[PDB]
Amino acid sequence: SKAFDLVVIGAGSGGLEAGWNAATLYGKRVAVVDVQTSHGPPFYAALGGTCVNVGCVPKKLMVTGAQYMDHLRESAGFGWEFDGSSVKANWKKLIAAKNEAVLDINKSYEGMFNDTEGLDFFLGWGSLESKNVVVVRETADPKSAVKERLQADHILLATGSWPQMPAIPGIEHCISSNEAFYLPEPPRRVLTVGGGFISVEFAGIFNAYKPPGGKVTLCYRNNLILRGFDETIREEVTKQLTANGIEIMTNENPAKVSLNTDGSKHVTFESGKTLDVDVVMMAIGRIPRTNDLQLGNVGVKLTPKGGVQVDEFSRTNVPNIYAIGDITDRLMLTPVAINEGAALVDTVFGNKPRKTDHTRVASAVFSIPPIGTCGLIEEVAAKEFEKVAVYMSSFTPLMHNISGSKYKKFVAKIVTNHSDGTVLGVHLLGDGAPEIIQAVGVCLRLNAKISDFYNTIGVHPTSAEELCSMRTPSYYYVKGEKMEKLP
Amino acid sequence: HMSKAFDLVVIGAGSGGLEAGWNAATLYGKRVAVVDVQTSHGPPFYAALGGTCVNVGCVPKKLMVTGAQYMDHLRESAGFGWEFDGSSVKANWKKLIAAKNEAVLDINKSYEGMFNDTEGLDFFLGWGSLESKNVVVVRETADPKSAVKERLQADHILLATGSWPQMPAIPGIEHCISSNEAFYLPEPPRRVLTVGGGFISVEFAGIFNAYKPPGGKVTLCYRNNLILRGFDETIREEVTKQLTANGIEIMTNENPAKVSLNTDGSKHVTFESGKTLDVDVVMMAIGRIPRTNDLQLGNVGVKLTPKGGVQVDEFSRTNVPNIYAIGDITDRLMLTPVAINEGAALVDTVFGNKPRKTDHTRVASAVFSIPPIGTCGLIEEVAAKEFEKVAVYMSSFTPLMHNISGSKYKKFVAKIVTNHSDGTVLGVHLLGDGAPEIIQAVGVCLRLNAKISDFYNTIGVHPTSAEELCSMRTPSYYYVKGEKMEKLP
Ligand SMILES: Cc1cc2nc3c(=O)[nH]c(=O)nc-3n(C[C@H](O)[C@H](O)[C@H](O)COP(=O)(O)OP(=O)(O)OC[C@H]3O[C@@H](n4cnc5c(N)ncnc54)[C@H](O)[C@@H]3O)c2cc1C
Ligand SMILES: Cc1cc2nc3c(=O)[nH]c(=O)nc-3n(C[C@H](O)[C@H](O)[C@H](O)COP(=O)(O)OP(=O)(O)OC[C@H]3O[C@@H](n4cnc5c(N)ncnc54)[C@H](O)[C@@H]3O)c2cc1C
Ligand SMILES: CC(=O)N1C[C@H]2CC[C@@H]1c1ccccc12
Ligand SMILES: [Br-]
Ligand SMILES: [Br-]
Ligand SMILES: [Br-]
Ligand SMILES: [Br-]
Known part of the structure; x- marks a missing residue:
């Protein structure tokens, strides 16, 4: 048996942020449990979490690889010549490069644990034995061999989701x-x-x-x-x-x-x-990963949809047991899980309660071409506000008239509360959209208005400068109904 | 043949001059003439209708940098499994130049059609110069002895002739x-x-x-x-x-x-x-120098600076009351969006009774090097002269994708410079793929007096380079009364 200030079940995006912050910022004694030390079969997720092992990190590398299909074709309009019949896409090479990058990350987290005081990793399946006891077994079966029994002042549920x-x-x-x-x-x-x-x-x-x-x-x-x-x-x-x-x-x-x-x-x-x-x-879809935790042993309440129920500070109904990340079945994004983990530890082990703001979170889709978005879409805004304006720009950029991909329209839309100009949402489609949108997320925390965008001087030539060139709404929502002009 | 009369005559149909002329005619109902020396790009005069950016500047050079980037894409594609006959690769410069020429000419033609179509917005071909406070002469060449094509009467005159190598x-x-x-x-x-x-x-x-x-x-x-x-x-x-x-x-x-x-x-x-x-x-x-020589400014006494640009106040006014100057001719920040902003502000002030001056601080800009730069605001050594305590937040690393592409030399650099006394962001400096696109919304942030905590409190978009800007909470080092140091004393 072993004694800890905090035991974290799940060594993932949120769980590692919480564990590392508790140990190094507040000098607490932390244990973290995960089922696998590196990526792939049989459990797929592992030390580092879903994003690192079978999520954002490897999928982004693979989308980058797929983008070369477009780059090779599009180079011709700019004068590049080569033997098109010789082109082939080697998937095995892609997967091997991806596997090596992920494994490198696995190993670095291993050394992080070995190098950090008060931060211990345990391999196995964690579940709740009692309000202050986390058990670690050999397999997901609640009857397999016990490997550790962890006494915990605080317990953090951070096991993620599953397809x-x-x-x-x-x-x-x-x-x-x-x-x-x-x-x-x-x-x-x-x-x-x-x-x-x-x-x-x-x-x-x-x-x-x-x-x-x-x-x-x-x-x-x-x-x-x-x-x-x-x-x-x-x-x-x-x-x-x-x-x-x-x-x-x-x-x-x-x-x-x-x-x-x-x-x-x-x-x-x-x-x-x-x-x-x-x-x-x-x-x-992906659903919260709750079944192996034996939440019935302690009475942790689930929502009707299957998430662990939490208040704004990530507290369950059971004192000293918390939940963050995809297991709460809210915004399933890695940076939100990280933010939740840090707020949790600042609240429990520091002298300043903090709660994560789940509004105006920027996010992306790495489609080809990609999406970047932050804030409300117009039809959601139209139910919260009496007057909504939509500013829209949509055209094929000059370079894709030359590349030959004339279908690649760039779309930029700004959604405002028309009563005072406040920007409620920004939505982008086109090369660069995920990178363009990041600082828009900062703008929305400064109560930016449409005039703040249009009065900023553009950077030229970019796709992003379209966000600073829209003065006049394309259409409106009044009392929830779409219309081209105001009544 | 009789002279023609206008509310505003613009010399130079470039980035600033076209914004001013279009806005004066379409927003405020004024009668406008615009003068330029050539109707489409290239020799003999290179710049033309549309200005330096359109014809021999930002627009064509960005297309040509985009073409050059394919040398990197073709090589980098192998790390992700792409195989092809490397020995067959050739870069056809003639095709690049022809594609660029057709693109620029299409813009030329669209501007020509705007003038042909728009009431109160007229174009005159030739070399403009100042004869008197209210008369612009259009001649066949830059030589002031060359033949007169038009005389344009003007209540207000805008000098917007740009610069030259x-x-x-x-x-x-x-x-x-x-x-x-x-x-x-x-x-x-x-x-x-x-x-x-x-x-x-x-x-x-x-x-x-x-x-x-x-x-x-x-x-x-x-x-x-x-x-x-x-x-x-x-x-x-x-x-x-x-x-x-x-x-x-x-x-x-x-x-x-x-x-x-x-x-x-x-x-x-x-x-x-x-x-x-x-x-x-x-x-x-x-370097590039302002194009003042051919305007015959001595005829009216418009003052130049020691450096050689047209001297202006914050509202673009010369020392001659009804004569204005914007853009590269003022020999300040030579950027197309600054000239556009100055031209819009001037027209709102003169004809719209809504006075406004351009803010020349916290202007976002880019270098389309390979890889590119995006920047907005003060560099740290400049900030250290004006602020008692300056903090620098810095992240520099090779991104994961370039460990697979093979271009491991491609370190992404993100730096935020602050007034450490209150956290205000003074400047943001970026090097790496995407940096010109990332920096645009940063310009809006600085216009809104963002502090470092506003960046850190924002949740990142993952995985991106840009999210580095929202994960920096501890200074890498400081300047204290001008002196660089890792720690505060
Ligand atoms: C294909 C894919 C692509 C994605 N792309 C993105 C993207 O681009 N951007 C983005 O922001 N998000 C993306 N996500 C979502 C992101 O991966 C999650 O939001 C994030 O990983 C959740 O963090 P978490 O801390 O809740 O848990 P996770 O990161 O899922 O970690 C949970 C961990 O718990 C371990 N575990 C589970 N049960 C037990 C148990 N009983 N005992 C011990 N350990 C256990 C698991 O092995 C896992 O390592 C993607 C997801 C997927 C599936
Ligand atoms: C190679 C290059 C790359 C650049 N890249 C960028 C970039 O990426 N981003 C950016 O923001 N800026 C860039 N610039 C700068 C940008 O081109 C200038 O800042 C901008 O064009 C200045 O606008 P303006 O209105 O002052 O003058 P211009 O746009 O230069 O217009 C002046 C016009 O006046 C005409 N003219 C001159 N004398 C007379 C006369 N006597 N009578 C009539 N017409 C006359 C000229 O033919 C010309 O069309 C670049 C410049 C160069 C040279
Ligand atoms: C002014 C300018 O940009 N030039 C570039 C080049 C060709 C014409 C002119 C010039 C004068 C003298 C020597 C070389 C040159
Ligand atoms: Br479906
Ligand atoms: Br649907
Ligand atoms: Br060639
Ligand atoms: Br902060």
């Missing part, structure tokens, strides 16, 4: 993003199921690395992908994915999957349509 | 070119010397480095010790290293003394030190 798999016949013949990161070969025909960012990002990755004759299809059960993003941008990215050879099947949903004699999969949709593919990747 | 008076200067000619070279030079340490020399060095034929070499020389004076010093040193790493030779503390022709017609450069260099093109990029 949601629908209850359809043949679901066992589908994969999730976890397995996609380790496919031995790039699939020639693949169906990505879902309208969210993971489905869209992997569609672009597979589209660039598919062997000759390949085809990527994305299906989504409703009418328009990327629910929760700006509607203009949802429509445009649909158009631009289609322009690069991806087939978008909206209003379609798999009803069953069966095995073909050649090893491929036969998908039947609810509509009766059918599609044969080599890989079916389900990306329909 | 400076050429040093050395023997053999006739064998050298400027950026104007660089935009029209029939073939890419095998060996080229770019002379100068400023952004134009650096940007063109990158362009020539990508399009040079097999076995070529780009050399950049600068007469002082470190290129890119005025930019963050960490970034000055890093850009130097990363240009060197891509095969550009940087000769600092060197300056051409004379140029002669070898018997084969190549240029033989002798430096002041006695070193020699043989090249096919010498491009001078040592």
Whole structure:
């Protein structure tokens, strides 16, 4: 048995921020538990978390790789010549480079633990034995061999989320993003199921690395992908994915999957349509990872949707037990989990309570081309405010008239409270959008108005200067109803 | 044939002059004439309708830097698994130049159509000069003895003629070119010397480095010790290293003394030190000077500064009440968006009874070097002279993607400079892919008097380079009454 100020279950984005801050900033005794010391099968996530191992970090490297399909074609308009028939995309090389980068990160976290006073790592599966006891077992089975018993003044639940798999016949013949990161070969025909960012990002990755004759299809059960993003941008990215050879099947949903004699999969949709593919990747959602924690031993309350219930300071209903990150089933982003972890420790072990602000969080989609966004979309703003103005700019940049990718319209939209000019949301589609949006997140914390943007001098030539060139609304929402002019 | 009369006559149909003229005619109903010397880009006069940025400046050079970036993309693609016949790769400069020419000409034509269409906004072709306080003469050439095409009566006159490359008076200067000619070279030079340490020399060095034929070499020389004076010093040193790493030779503390022709017609450069260099093109990029000579300002007594620009007050007014000047002719910040801002502010003040002056502080700007620079506000050594305590927050590392691409020399640098007494951000300085796009919204932040805590409190977008700006909480070092030190005393 061992005694600690804080025990953290999950060595992920939020859990490591909390543990490192508690130990080094406040001199507390910290233990952190995770199920694997490095990335990949069998548990996929590991020391460092989902983002490091099977999330933001590797997917961004793979999207960067897929972008070269466009760069090689687009170079020709600027005078670059080479033998186009010799081009091939080596997926095995991509995966190996990615594996080496992730493993390097795994190892550096290992040395962080070895080098930091009061910060200890334990390998295994953590669960709640009692209000102040965390048990670590050999496997997820609550009857496997006990490896450690950790006495804890404070306990932090930070186990993340896991892919949601629908209850359809043949679901066992589908994969999730976890397995996609380790496919031995790039699939020639693949169906990505879902309208969210993971489905869209992997569609672009597979589209660039598919062997000759390949085809990527994305299906989504409703009418328009990327629910929760700006509607203009949802429509445009649909158009631009289609322009690069991806087939978008909206209003379609798999009803069953069966095995073909050649090893491929036969998908039947609810509509009766059918599609044969080599890989079916389900990306329909991620759900809080609560089942192995034995929350019933202590009575931690869950919400109806399955998250651990928390107040604004990450406190559960059980004193001294906290939860942060995807397990709270709110904003599933790595920088939000980190922010929550730091606020938690500042509150518990320092003399200044802090709560994370979940509004005006900038985020991105690394689609090809990508999205950057911060704040409210117009239809959400129109329910909170009597008068909303939308400023819009949408055009193909000069360089893509030369590159030949004339479909690559850049979209920039600013949403305001028209009563006082306050910027409520900014939404971008196009090369650079994730980088452009970061400092917009800072602007929204300075009560920036549309006139603050338009009165700033532009940097020229950039896509970003469009944000400082919009003076006149394109249209409005009054009492919730869209209209081109004010009454 | 009779003279024509206007509320406003603009000499120079460039970045500032077109903003002023369009706004005066379309926002305030005034009658406007605009004068320029050429209706589309290129020789003989290079700049033309649209101005220096459109014709031989920001717009074409950015297209050409984008073309040059593909040399890096093609090489870097192999780390991510892309395979192709490297021996087959060729950079066709003629196709680049033709694509750029068609793009610029399309802009020329659209501006020509704006004038043909817009009530109260007229274009006159020729050389404008001041005859009297209310008369602009348009002549066939810059020579004031050349024939008169029009006389334009004007209640208000706007001088917006821009600037021009400076050429040093050395023997053999006739064998050298400027950026104007660089935009029209029939073939890419095998060996080229770019002379100068400023952004134009650096940007063109990158362009020539990508399009040079097999076995070529780009050399950049600068007469002082470190290129890119005025930019963050960490970034000055890093850009130097990363240009060197891509095969550009940087000769600092060197300056051409004379140029002669070898018997084969190549240029033989002798430096002041006695070193020699043989090249096919010498491009001078040592500075740009305001274009005042042809305006005949003595006719009306408009005062120039010692430096040579038109003297103006904060509202762009010369010493002659109804004559104004904006843009590069004022020899201050030579940027297109500053000239545009000055022109809009002038017209709002004169014709819109809503007075406004341009803020020349905290202006965001970029260098499209490879990799590029984005900056806004004060460099730390300047801040240390004005503030008792200055803090510097700094992050510099090779991003993960360039550990796979192989370009491990591509360190991304992010620096924030503050007044440590109250946290106010005084300047932000960036080096790396995306930096010009990242810095734009930073300019809005500084206009809003952002403090370092406003940056740190903002949640990052992950994974990006930009999120480094929102994860810096502890100074790397300080300046205390001018003195650099790791810790406060
Ligand atoms: C494909 C993909 C792409 C993404 N891309 C982005 C992106 O670009 N940007 C972004 O901001 N977010 C992205 N995310 C989301 C991001 O990964 C999560 O928001 C973040 O990782 C959650 O942090 P966390 O601290 O809640 O948990 P995690 O980082 O998930 O860590 C939880 C850890 O708990 C461990 N664990 C689980 N159960 C137990 C147990 N019983 N005992 C011990 N250890 C346990 C797990 O092994 C894991 O390491 C992406 C996610 C995915 C799946
Ligand atoms: C190579 C290069 C790259 C650049 N890159 C950038 C960049 O990336 N970003 C940026 O912000 N700035 C850049 N600049 C600077 C930018 O081009 C200038 O700051 C801007 O064009 C100045 O605008 P203006 O209105 O002062 O004059 P201009 O735009 O220069 O317009 C002046 C016009 O006056 C005309 N003219 C001159 N004399 C007469 C006369 N007597 N009668 C009639 N017409 C006349 C000229 O033909 C010209 O069209 C660059 C400049 C160069 C040279
Ligand atoms: C003024 C300018 O930019 N020039 C560039 C080059 C060609 C024309 C002119 C010039 C004069 C003297 C020597 C070399 C040159
Ligand atoms: Br779906
Ligand atoms: Br929908
Ligand atoms: Br060529
Ligand atoms: Br702070």
